[PDB]
Amino acid sequence: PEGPELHLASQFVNEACRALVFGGCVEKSSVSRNPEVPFESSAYRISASARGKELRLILSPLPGAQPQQEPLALVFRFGMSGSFQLVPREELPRHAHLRFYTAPPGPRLALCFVDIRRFGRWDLGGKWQPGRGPCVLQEYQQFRENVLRNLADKAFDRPICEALLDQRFFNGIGNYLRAEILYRLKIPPFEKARSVLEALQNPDLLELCHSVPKEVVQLGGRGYGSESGEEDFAAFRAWLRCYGMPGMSSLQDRHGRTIWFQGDPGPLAP
DNA sequence: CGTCCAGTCTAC
DNA sequence: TAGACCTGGACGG
């Protein structure tokens, strides 16, 4: 998942947990190489926020919840399959690697981090990854400045399609958004990144880095996702103009990732 | 049955 | 850089 999916997953946790109270421990699957969450409360609320391709849960005990516990923050990266679901406690999906359990009164639910391929990670401590740039969705001006002020970096020597995956400058952009953004401006994907960015130093490339992903969020649904039904998933495939679409070209970048585009591949093409 | 395809992370 | 980390669906024989 990319920035829109991290964002929608955060909105899901906030809306679906608004009136839920969790209790007990935070349970990790035995196969998961991620750390155990040292947290226990008779009564805590779960809330979320997204920044780029990371999501932060806050575990907030209620007044007088036992054991005495301070709020705990967990930050998640989703890799290729990460996901959050609210399921009935005894109908855990396969690959539910981390689980928060509702307290009574009510139907016993589990909020689960579900990750088929286990590329996802969480760290104890609530901090965003050092080095990740501002969120293209929620910190646009900070995102735009962090790019324009550092065009000297060797990161911008590379093809624009490669630079757009560097989470130090485009936190929240992944393989589908880089195709959709470049297609909107018909920028050849193997144009040099510094060449296309220097001008800014009729929406430009950095505006689209915000507004294109915002469109996926505004579809509602769960972006490149089905944790909302088939309706929302087909809604997303219909929004796509370029990623995977018939009559589009594709090449491998230097990291073996597929870039979709129309027309001129650009000068630094392999 | 088999191949091929779908975001970091780190050891060369 | 390239291979590693994973599972599963879509396809081909």
Residue numbers in the entry: 2 to 202, 222 to 290
Question: What does the original paper state about this entry?
Answer:
Human endonuclease VIII-like 1 (hNEIL1) is a bifunctional DNA glycosylase of the Fpg/Nei family, which catalyzes the removal of damaged bases and subsequent incision of the newly generated abasic sites. Unlike traditional enzymes which are commonly referred to as highly specific biocatalysts, one special feature for hNEIL1 is its unique capability to recognize a wide range of substrates, including formamidopyrimidines, hydantoin lesions, oxidized, and dihydro-modified pyrimidine bases, derived from all four canonical bases. Here, by integrating structural, computational, and biochemical investigations, we show that hNEIL1 uses a triage mechanism to achieve broad specificity and reduce futile repair of normal bases. This mechanism involves two mutually competing interaction states: an activated state that commits catalysis and BER, and a quarantine state that temporarily separates and prevents the flipped base from catalysis via auto-inhibition.
To rule out the possibility that the observed interaction is caused by mutations introduced to hNEIL1 for crystallization experiments, we used an orthogonal approach in which a modified nucleobase substrate is bound by the native protein containing the wild type active site. We synthesized a 2′-fluoro-substituted stable mimic of DHU (FDHU), which allows binding but not catalysis by hNEIL1. Indeed, in the hNEIL1(R242)-FDHU structure, residues R242 and Y244 again swaps positions, recapitulating the observed 244-in conformation in the hNEIL1(R242)-DHU and hNEIL1(R242)-DHT structures. Apparently, the hydrogen bond interaction between residue 242 of hNEIL1 and the substrate which is present in the 242-in conformation is absent in the 244-in structures, indicating the loss of a key stabilizing factor of binding and catalysis. Thus, the 244-in conformation is incompetent of glycosylase activity and hence represents a distinct interaction mode with potentially special function. In contrast to the 242-in conformation, the 244-in conformation is catalytically inactive and functionally protects the nucleobase from cleavage, in competition with the activated state. In order to destabilize the quarantine state, we rationally designed hNEIL1(R242, G249P) and hNEIL1(R242, Y244H) to disrupt the flexibility of the loop or the aromatic stacking interactions respectively. Instead of the quarantine state originally observed in hNEIL1(R242)–FDHU structure, we found that both two mutants switched to the activated state as expected.
